[PDB]
Amino acid sequence: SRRRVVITGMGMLSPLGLDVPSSWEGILAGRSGIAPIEHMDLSAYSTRFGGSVKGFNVEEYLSAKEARKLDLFIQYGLAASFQAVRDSGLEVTDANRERIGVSMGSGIGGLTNIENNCRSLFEQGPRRISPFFVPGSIINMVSGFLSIHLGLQGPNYALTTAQTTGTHSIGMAARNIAYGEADVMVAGGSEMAACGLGLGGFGAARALSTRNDEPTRASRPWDRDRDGFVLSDGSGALVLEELEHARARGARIYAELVGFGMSGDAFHMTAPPEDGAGAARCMKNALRDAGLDPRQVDYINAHGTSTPAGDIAEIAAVKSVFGEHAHALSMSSTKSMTGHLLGAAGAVEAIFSVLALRDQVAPPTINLDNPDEGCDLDLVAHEAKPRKIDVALSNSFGFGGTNGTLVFRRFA
Amino acid sequence: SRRRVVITGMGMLSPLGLDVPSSWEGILAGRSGIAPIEHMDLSAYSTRFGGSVKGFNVEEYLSAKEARKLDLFIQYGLAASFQAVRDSGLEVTDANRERIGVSMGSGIGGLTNIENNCRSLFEQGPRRISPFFVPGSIINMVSGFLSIHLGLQGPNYALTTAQTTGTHSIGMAARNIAYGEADVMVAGGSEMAACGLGLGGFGAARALSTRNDEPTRASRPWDRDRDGFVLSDGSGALVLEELEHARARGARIYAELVGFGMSGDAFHMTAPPEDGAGAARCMKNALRDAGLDPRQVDYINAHGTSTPAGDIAEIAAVKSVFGEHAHALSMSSTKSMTGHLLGAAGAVEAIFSVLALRDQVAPPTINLDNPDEGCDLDLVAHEAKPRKIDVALSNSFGFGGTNGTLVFRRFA
Numbered sequence: 001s002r003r004r005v006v007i008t009g010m011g012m013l014s015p016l017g018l019d020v021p022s023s024w025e026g027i028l029a030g031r032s033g034i035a036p037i038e039h040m041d042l043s044a045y046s047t048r049f050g051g052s053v054k055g056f057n058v059e060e061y062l063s064a065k066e067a068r069k070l071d072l073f074i075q076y077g078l079a080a081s082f083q084a085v086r087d088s089g090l091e092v093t094d095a096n097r098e099r100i101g102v103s104m105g106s107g108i109g110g111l112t113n114i115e116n117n118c119r120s121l122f123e124q125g126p127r128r129i130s131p132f133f134v135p136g137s138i139i140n141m142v143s144g145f146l147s148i149h150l151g152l153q154g155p156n157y158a159l160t161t162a163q164t165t166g167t168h169s170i171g172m173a174a175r176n177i178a179y180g181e182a183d184v185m186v187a188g189g190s191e192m193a194a195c196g197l198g199l200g201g202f203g204a205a206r207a208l209s210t211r212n213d214e215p216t217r218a219s220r221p222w223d224r225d226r227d228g229f230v231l232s233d234g235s236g237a238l239v240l241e242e243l244e245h246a247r248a249r250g251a252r253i254y255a256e257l258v259g260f261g262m263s264g265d266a267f268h269m270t271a272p273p274e275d276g277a278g279a280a281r282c283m284k285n286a287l288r289d290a291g292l293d294p295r296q297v298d299y300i301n302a303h304g305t306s307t308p309a310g311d312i313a314e315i316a317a318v319k320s321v322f323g324e325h326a327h328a329l330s331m332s333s334t335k336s337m338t339g340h341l342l343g344a345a346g347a348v349e350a351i352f353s354v355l356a357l358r359d360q361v362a363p364p365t366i367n368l369d370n371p372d373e374g375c376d377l378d379l380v381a382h383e384a385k386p387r388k389i390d391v392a393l394s395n396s397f398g399f400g401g402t403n404g405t406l407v408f409r410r411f412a
Numbered sequence: 413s414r415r416r417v418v419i420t421g422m423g424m425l426s427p428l429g430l431d432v433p434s435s436w437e438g439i440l441a442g443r444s445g446i447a448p449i450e451h452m453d454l455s456a457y458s459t460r461f462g463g464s465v466k467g468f469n470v471e472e473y474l475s476a477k478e479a480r481k482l483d484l485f486i487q488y489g490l491a492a493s494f495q496a497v498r499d500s501g502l503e504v505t506d507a508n509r510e511r512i513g514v515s516m517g518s519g520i521g522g523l524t525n526i527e528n529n530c531r532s533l534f535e536q537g538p539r540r541i542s543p544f545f546v547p548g549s550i551i552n553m554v555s556g557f558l559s560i561h562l563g564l565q566g567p568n569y570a571l572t573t574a575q576t577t578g579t580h581s582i583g584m585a586a587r588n589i590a591y592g593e594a595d596v597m598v599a600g601g602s603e604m605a606a607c608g609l610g611l612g613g614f615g616a617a618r619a620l621s622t623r624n625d626e627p628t629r630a631s632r633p634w635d636r637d638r639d640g641f642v643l644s645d646g647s648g649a650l651v652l653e654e655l656e657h658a659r660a661r662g663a664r665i666y667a668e669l670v671g672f673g674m675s676g677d678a679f680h681m682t683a684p685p686e687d688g689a690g691a692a693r694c695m696k697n698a699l700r701d702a703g704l705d706p707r708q709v710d711y712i713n714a715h716g717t718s719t720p721a722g723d724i725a726e727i728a729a730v731k732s733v734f735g736e737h738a739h740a741l742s743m744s745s746t747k748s749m750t751g752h753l754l755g756a757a758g759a760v761e762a763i764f765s766v767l768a769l770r771d772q773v774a775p776p777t778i779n780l781d782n783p784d785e786g787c788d789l790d791l792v793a794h795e796a797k798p799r800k801i802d803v804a805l806s807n808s809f810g811f812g813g814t815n816g817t818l819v820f821r822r823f824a
């Protein structure tokens with residue numbers, strides 16, 4: 001047997017906001033966080049826009065001196081984590097610190113630091129590389145810094161599964177608690193891949209929208225005029241907690257995490273199979289894990305990246321899994337508003353799935369002006385839809401064909 | 413309920429060889445894999461040597477057209493993975509492909525490729541960034557490419573926990589099998605951080621030995637004249653398999669994985685605590701997980717990096733965990749010969765621990781000419797020691813205070 005895992009705290013930086021409630025207000029209003037990227041000469045680039053975090057003040061979290069040691073993606077991960085831990089009300093003590101761990105990940109890690117240190121290396125030579133280049137750039141330093149700052153001695157690790165990172169981080173942290181290796185985990189992901197290297201690297205694969213004239217209309221999941229994903233920055237963290245532990249201290253419980261699925265497509269380095277067979281296996285594994293029938297799902301937060309092949313693969317996968325229930329659930333892509341936060345996508349979208357449960361509302365897929373061929377599900381086009389939601393899924397389908405699904409259920 | 417996990421296949425690239433038997437021959441003969449680096453000009457660097465993989469032929473594994481797309485860390489991880497799967501005798505079929513996954517990790521991943529593309533970006537422009545920049549560099553793509561080549565549809569992920577990566581990858585993969593999420597996992601790690609940012613960045617932290625004039629003597633764990641770690645490249649992969657699945661197909665079983673521990677130090681971003689308190693918590697977790705009396709431990713493959721603080725912290729931790737039995741077990745650092753493969757260290761060292769069990773021999777700590785203050789355990793100085801080994805423990809410690817321990821034992 002297995003213990004129950006609940007969500008007691010959430011934290012976020014996104015293109016919509018510097019916290020969860022500001023971000024969520026944007027989501028339910030259909031607001032875009034996408035804009036031309038500033039303080040960068042993007043003249044030579046085919047994409048000049050994305051989802052930046054606006055007005056982030058790291059000195060609310062760290063001293064200037066500690067922040068100078070860390071890449072932006074680590075700053076963002078620590079901000080969401082500190083928010084989530086504050087939101088949980090949890091008191092770390094000598095009696096529980098060995099039972100509290102961290103799994104905060106990233107898909108691409110420290111590109112901004114790699115750029116700035118490459119500048120020094122190329123121009124001046126290796127003796128100008130920062131002493132903090134390695135520890136301030138490696139993906140496990142959100143978990144590392146958070147554990148040092150809060151005195152967490154539980155399991156300490158970091159996943160990196162490209163665009164699936166946040167989903168896998170949360171699911172695997174839930175397993176840690178369910179199987180008794182921890183009582184509390186801080187889990188999620190963070191990403192800062194604006195930089196030239198993110199825009200240039202994805203741009204070279206022609207993976208990005210190039211709708212430079214109308215950045216807010218670029219991310220248009222399942223719309224016939226979509227032309228690839230929009231790159232976005234930020235972070236999501238959840239406090240996952242064993243249910244009896246949460247009840248004993250009088251925690252506020254947002255929702256229960258009942259299911260976690262994983263699969264591999266074993267198909268292609270970057271593209272999904274046309275029928276989303278892997279995504280279907282992963283959703284079926286998550287529902288089996290939750291002991292739920294597909295007919296019990298009310299709301300899906302899609303991966304919904306605005307890539308032609310990805311978006312159609314998900315429709316096929318959902319039709320395959322859900323059969324005569326596929327039209328009754330509501331499925332939306334919040335990436336229509338946030339863009340694609342890569343390894344943090346699954347983290348912020350797990351939060352939006354939990355808030356869909358709290359508020360009984362399916363967030364919109366904005367920009368869905370002309371659904372493409374076969375995109376005839378309830379994709380919540382344009383405007384948020386109040387509805388009954390007992391069970392919400394969140395999907396992430398990333399490079400290497402790596403798939404993750406989380407199942408959340410209302411708690412009372 | 414929790415299933416038993418055995419080792420049925422192993423694969424490796426190291427500074428001592430292009431497979432496991434050749435590497436292990438070097439280990440038992442006390443041979444150094446460390447030499448001046450030939451693949452780039454290091455005259456401006458304070459460290460000009462390391463553990464390179466010599467004579468690697470990627471066309472033993474993959475077409476030249478595919479290999480040109482992939483950072484060396486991916487090529488090394490695939491080579492070790494392919495060797496491990498072949499060594500296992502396992503046949504992937506429609507009946508089992510959903511139950512076989514992969515967890516191959518890296519500390520830094522494709523830094524060579526990111527550096528080369530950053531040079532293109534800065535000197536020329538984004539138009540010269542490779543289309544394969546992202547899928548040829550990011551850490552999850554060992555697991556990704558391996559799954560595509562062999563048709564593995566089970567859990568597909570990657571850890572990145574700095575120098576603890578290979579140990580965490582193997583332990584977490586064992587938990588997948590133990591808890592019924594998979595029947596077979598390919599798990600381990602790969603690293604190739606020997607580029608200007610890697611050598612420069614560890615150099616700027618003054619973390620590396622600067623013994624340029626005698627590279628084979630540079631790595632000297634617990635020696636009073638040690639002056640930092642030696643940077644090394646390669647990969648380890650193991651096929652982990654549920655016991656009854658291995659028995660059912662008549663697999664050759666090398667050893668059983670009986671224990672896994674993690675802990676965070678919660679001490680410092682890069683320094684280990686002097687008393688080894690986090691390492692001790694991690695080993696005690698692993699020994700309890702294995703249902704063992706600490707006196708059952710015969711052999712410890714130490715982290716043993718040849719840093720002043722790391723090496724003495726490990727003595728303190730072993731004395732704290734094992735008490736008077738600390739004087740009866742044998743503990744060695746194979747990094748004395750291989751150097752520090754960073755995210756691959758725990759993977760190659762897990763393999764060396766399993767071969768210590770197969771061959772009933774403790775590998776030597778070479779270069780241990782003058783053991784430092786308090787370094788008065790059996791550290792198998794200079795020469796391999798034939799001895800009874802029923803239980804072997806492999807330790808890793810990393811940036812962020814992240815600790816892993818694996819416990820292996822002979823299978824009958």
Ligand SMILES: CCN(CC)C(=O)c1cc(C)no1
Pocket residue numbers: 269475477478479481557560561
């Ligand atoms: C054109 C050469 N090939 C196919 C063998 C490749 O580059 C290749 C194989 C996989 C997997 N991804 O890409």
